[PDB]
Amino acid sequence: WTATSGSCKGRCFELQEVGPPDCRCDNLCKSYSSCCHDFDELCLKTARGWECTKDRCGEVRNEENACHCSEDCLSRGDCCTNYQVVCKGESHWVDDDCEEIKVPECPAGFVRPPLIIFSVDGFRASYMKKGSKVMPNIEKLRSCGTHAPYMRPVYPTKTFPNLYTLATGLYPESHGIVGNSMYDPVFDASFHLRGREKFNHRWWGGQPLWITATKQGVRAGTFFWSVSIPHERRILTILQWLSLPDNERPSVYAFYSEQPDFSGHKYGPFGPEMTNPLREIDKTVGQLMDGLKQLRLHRCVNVIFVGDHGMEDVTCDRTEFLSNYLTNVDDITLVPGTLGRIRAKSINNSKYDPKTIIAALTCKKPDQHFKPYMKQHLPKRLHYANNRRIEDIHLLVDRRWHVARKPLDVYKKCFFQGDHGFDNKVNSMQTVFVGYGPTFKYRTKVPPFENIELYNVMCDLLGLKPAPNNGTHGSLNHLLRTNTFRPTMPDEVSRPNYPGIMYLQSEFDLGCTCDDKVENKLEELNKRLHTKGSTKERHLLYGRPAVLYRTSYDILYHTDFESGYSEIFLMPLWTSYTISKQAEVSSIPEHLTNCVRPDVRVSPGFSQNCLAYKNDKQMSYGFLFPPYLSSSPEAKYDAFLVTNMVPMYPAFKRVWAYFQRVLVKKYASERNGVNVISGPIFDYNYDGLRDTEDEIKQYVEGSSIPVPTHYYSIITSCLDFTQPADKCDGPLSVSSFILPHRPDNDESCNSSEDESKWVEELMKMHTARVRDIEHLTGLDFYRKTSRSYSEILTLKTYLHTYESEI
Ligand SMILES: *[C@@H]1O[C@H](CO)[C@@H](O[C@@H]2O[C@H](CO)[C@@H](O[C@@H]3O[C@H](CO[C@H]4O[C@H](CO)[C@@H](O)[C@H](O[C@H]5O[C@H](CO)[C@@H](O)[C@H](O)[C@@H]5O[C@H]5O[C@H](CO)[C@@H](O)[C@H](O)[C@@H]5O)[C@@H]4O)[C@@H](O)[C@H](O[C@H]4O[C@H](CO)[C@@H](O)[C@H](O)[C@@H]4O[C@H]4O[C@H](CO)[C@@H](O)[C@H](O)[C@@H]4O)[C@@H]3O)[C@H](O)[C@H]2NC(C)=O)[C@H](O)[C@H]1NC(C)=O
Ligand SMILES: Cc1nc2cc(OCc3n[nH]c(=O)n3C)c(C3CC3)cc2s1
Ligand SMILES: [Ca+2]
Ligand SMILES: [Cl-]
Ligand SMILES: [K+]
Ligand code: NA
Ligand SMILES: [Zn+2]
Known part of the structure; x- marks a missing residue:
């Protein structure tokens, strides 16, 4: 029970969360049904929209407006992001020539350049070239900063496993988020996208960047945004936090976009409907950069633009059905889709045999679009086996395909045209990385690299010691102007013998x-x-x-x-x-x-x-x-x-x-x-x-x-x-x-x-x-x-x- 009778007055998007039945005013309250009664009114203002106009310039402050165009807004830190453009004759950040950022150029009182992580769901690596005409803010970040042609996600190329790998530097098998859906047999509990169990802290292993920072005295803004808070409000909240006093201001921030993934599922990675979502994402980046420029932070902050995974063409007709291979189909549970995981429907069933399931699924049709594995026989590069939440039987699915248990599951549950989750070497699953700021290099291209490496670099950018992780610290030093991590070679533990001829x-x-x-x-x-x-x-x-x-x-x-x-x-x-x-x-x-x-x-x-x-x-x-x-x-x-x-x-x-x-x-x-x-x-x-x-x-x-x-x-x-x-x-x-x-x-x-x-x-x-x-x-x-x-x-x-x- 949350007695939602307290107030969010002066508390909107509070960084420190309070313990219910005190109501909550942080950006997670919506997810927990625990917001105070006046949260929408005070914290989700929308009056007059998101942009200044010529007539709003110099206005008398009206606290009801979504953002402000009054003289006092800059110091207050709550101008609309286009304020100085509309009212003070300034240019948009995207219209300025880029200029090398050799040193951080920060307001007095900043102890380190802030880091802002802009993560985009389902942003396939080829969008950077293919969408370039309609994403000029992103193109400027990319060409003026440090960029890779693409970044390799982890397997499975799903959202939660990848965002949590970004946060931790760990393989899913180590951090515990091994899919978007999971059964943990020790807890006897299930984890799903829909619902509340996914918030229980027992799912989430390792140590994510925000805890690493907090424990070492670096303050962190939120990483998880409730889906109902619009993108413009997320941006303004970050800009507001950056206007806090030195002792209250976070050093690390994250923005998350549900797009282009949400549209890509419906229309395919390159559906003509995909142009608009990319335009909208670019406009949001433009709002951030204009906002940063207004606050004189655009040559101070390090910005990372990063995806979780790409998106592939997948439709209903490309579904393999286990009911076409197995006679015992109702004796199994399948986690379905772009990967398969099989376990016994009932643990009381002593007739259940993984060996005979494997054999019935092995090379049975001429063009079979999945291959069965015991998880320990999966390619070792996937690092996908050492977790009780990963079922012993795994199906690796061909790109462009789905696996399901029975045909009824597909037409009783064609809608979609895109999906992801496949083998992490598949080109369509590849995603993006751009870093832009005083600590990244200027106009530099670096080779493709794996997302497990980024945690270390984010730690380097914030002067943090990273928790033990699967990155190889130093392997991304060539991304950085300074703050490099200088590792030493491990000491040899055993010295060899050099035997001569000693036996007849x-x-x-x-x-x-x-x-x-x-x-x-x-x-x-x-x-x-x-x-x-x-x-x-x-x-x-x-x-x-x-x-x-x-x-x-x-x-x-x-x-x-x-x-x-x-x-x-x-x-x-x-x-x-x-x-x-x-x-x-x-x-x-x-x-x-x-x-x-x-x-x-x-x-x-x-x-x-x-x-x-x-x-x-x-x-x-x-x-x-x-x-x-x-x-x-x-x-x-x-x-x-x-x-x-x-x-x-x-x-x-x-x-x-x-x-x-x-x-x-x-x-x-x-x-x-x-x-x-x-x-x-x-x-x-x-x-x-x-x-x-x-x-x-x-x-x-x-x-x-x-x-x-x-x-x-x-x-x-x-x-x-x-x-x-x-x-x-x-x-x-x-x-x-x-x-x-x-x-x-x-x-x-x-x-x-x-x-x-x-x-x-x-x-x-x-x-x-x-x-x-x-x-x-x-x-x-x-x-x-x-x-x-x-x-x-x-x-x-x-x-x-x-x-x-x-
Ligand atoms: C990728 O990088 C990561 C991070 O570096 C590497 O993972 C580490 O690997 C280490 C070696 O396997 C491992 O060290 C063990 O830790 C045990 C203590 O662990 C707890 O505390 C840590 C620290 O806070 C914590 O991180 C752990 O979290 C795990 O477990 C919880 C669930 O309880 C999960 O929420 C979380 O996601 C994570 O799970 C993952 O790791 C565990 C293994 O720890 C797996 O089982 C899971 O599947 C999942 O992958 C823990 O909360 C410690 O008890 C171990 O010590 C035993 O073994 C050593 C060997 O040296 C021996 O000396 C000791 O005596 C002891 O043996 C005794 O206990 C045995 C087992 O009970 C028993 O059989 C014996 O008889 C003995 O009595 C061990 O030191 C470390 O925990 C993980 N860390 C993480 C975050 O995963 C990983 O290797 C890298 N991968 C690659 C490919 O390089
Ligand atoms: C750079 C990073 N960004 C994020 C972003 C994250 O969450 C972003 C998010 N907000 N709202 C929502 O539905 N999602 C998925 C997470 C949480 C899923 C763990 C880790 C990281 S690490
Ligand atoms: Ca081993
Ligand atoms: Cl999954
Ligand atoms: K033999
Ligand atoms: Na064979
Ligand atoms: Zn998706």
Whole structure:
């Protein structure tokens, strides 16, 4: 109960919320049904509209008006935003030439440039170019400030997950807002767009920017505006707050627009009805900038213009129906639409089997427009699994499509023409970023980047220490004129051993054989040098990776490759090699077909063994450095060492072999040499982080050889591809992947065909950031380059998406 009998007089849009049954006058009261009786009258004034006119100039103040055109309004801070334009001969901000803002130009009493975050719902990245003629305020922000061609949202590309990632720097799996709809089985409670449960604080994890600021003594305006407060009032309230005394004035502010998303759902991303919403958004930005200019704040405030996600063409007829695949359709609950999440309708049903649901949904129609996954098999780049609110079964839906449970759900619940929610690499889901102000750069374009990075930057802009988050702090330093964050490289925790020859062949009883006893001071001194690391400068281009946890490992040198070999996991953590443009591919000779050779630098006790593989009828093996790319017939013997071997399902070897035999040489051709680092990943609890030894759920039968959940590779070359990978003077170019190590190829519906028809498509789906691989391995790459550390942090956050041009 709210006894709504108090007054909002002198209290309108109060920053500090009061505890009911005291009524409330803050911009959330409407959402809680708790406003005082006079809230509309006093706080939502609309009399005379939003703009000064020639006849209103110099008027006698009338407190009933929405905004004012009287002489006293500027000091009072409540003029209509076009006041000085209409009455004092001033130009609109959009009509002024832009001029570099080298330093903040702020009124006395400002301790730091304020930050204003203007967020737009459903603002697709291509609107900046395509709508440019009708958005001149936005175009000026964009061209005069710092801008990216687009900003990558998080998955799912829905509103709440993305706005909360913007606020926290966290993946949805960590912040807890994993969709627009959710069931939490621990609370046994549901979260929905409509309703009140979404306001309960138990949904919202991490630490959002407004709490980070408050806790560190920086005051914050509101971020969540009640839908019924018009845009013009939100702007005037921000302008009013900026006129408060120094000790009361917030330093951070947010404005939110429900558009263009609201219209885009009805008309599609490029419907002719979309012009007007973009015009209206531009006019609101114009009102803010004119307002800031009136207050002499337009060269003081940092402004961010940012979207949550884009918008795609989606109509009712493009719906797949689970009732077409499942007979048991009423025994499941589907969270539907641009993604699917399935769980049992009833937990008392012991006949419910996710395995048989997956099988009934796998590759059943020729052009099937969704693909089923256990959540732990989703591409690791989506970071969408480590939350009890994410159902074990997930459906990834093709762009332009919907999934629903039954046809009745679609015509009993065509209206819409746009929607979003799809895979976050999809071009139509991409959104916008512009920063404009003293702290951003002038007329600068920066590469595309992920929205998880912005929290850190907003903290930098406000001089705040960010809470622990998934951004990589420093990776966006190139956006900023000053206030950069200067990170140091993490300290290596374990130093390596460098073993020499310490074991005789006969000490190994591994059940391994090799036709290798087919036997000179030229090339015996030579092979000794190679084993001591004579070629290491060629294969380890950026220094050895640092191991950031306590463990026992050895560096192993060879003619063609270098590895860091784990005595705990019995295989390399990483294997590094360079393949020049001119390198040649050879085959595994017949005499070496099943050859595995003991490594005399490494004890039998710390070695894999061939008998385990023989005995394990499911598990085979592959090699991290490919025998196909050996530099000479003699060097090829190194690739068959037991220390270069890793466990692989036969289904996975089809993938791995095509990558190693065909694709590495192809990339070396296209890129002028590549350096490759490959290795295993163990993530049995799907939390995106390196497993400890006691977390491993599967071993090669009868042995202590742990089975990787994934295999990675990081492929680096010179950004200027006129220089070879091993002789690069400037910036680097990277692409990486984290391939799931699966015992079938059910994921790929075309896998009965030749690897050339399906493997590359699989790898593209499992594209990754070096940073993703770091989390997953506890390794730190690129320790020794001639490049700045911030540039390397940007490189580590890069994602090769394989999409066409935006
Ligand atoms: C992205 O960035 C984020 C932020 O850096 C990373 O997430 C962090 O990962 C850490 C490692 O997993 C994790 O550290 C653990 O924290 C536990 C205490 O956590 C509470 O307090 C913090 C701090 O205020 C708070 O943020 C947490 O909030 C979580 O939980 C609430 C719900 O209760 C949610 O509202 C919120 O959204 C968030 O949930 C998310 O994280 C949890 C895991 O914490 C997941 O379960 C959820 O799915 C969701 O993703 C908490 O309120 C602490 O207890 C842990 O300590 C145990 O494990 C360590 C290992 O070192 C061990 O030493 C300890 O002894 C202890 O073990 C004992 O307890 C075990 C478990 O009960 C038990 O099995 C053992 O037997 C032992 O007795 C641990 O230190 C940190 O909480 C999260 N933070 C956040 C915000 O998510 C994330 O890794 C990054 N992602 C990537 C890919 O890099
Ligand atoms: C820059 C940022 N803007 C916002 C804006 C936000 O909310 C904006 C908002 N106001 N009214 C409404 O319906 N929405 C969605 C939120 C809340 C959803 C959490 C976080 C952030 S972080
Ligand atoms: Ca893990
Ligand atoms: Cl959802
Ligand atoms: K086997
Ligand atoms: Na298949
Ligand atoms: Zn929407």
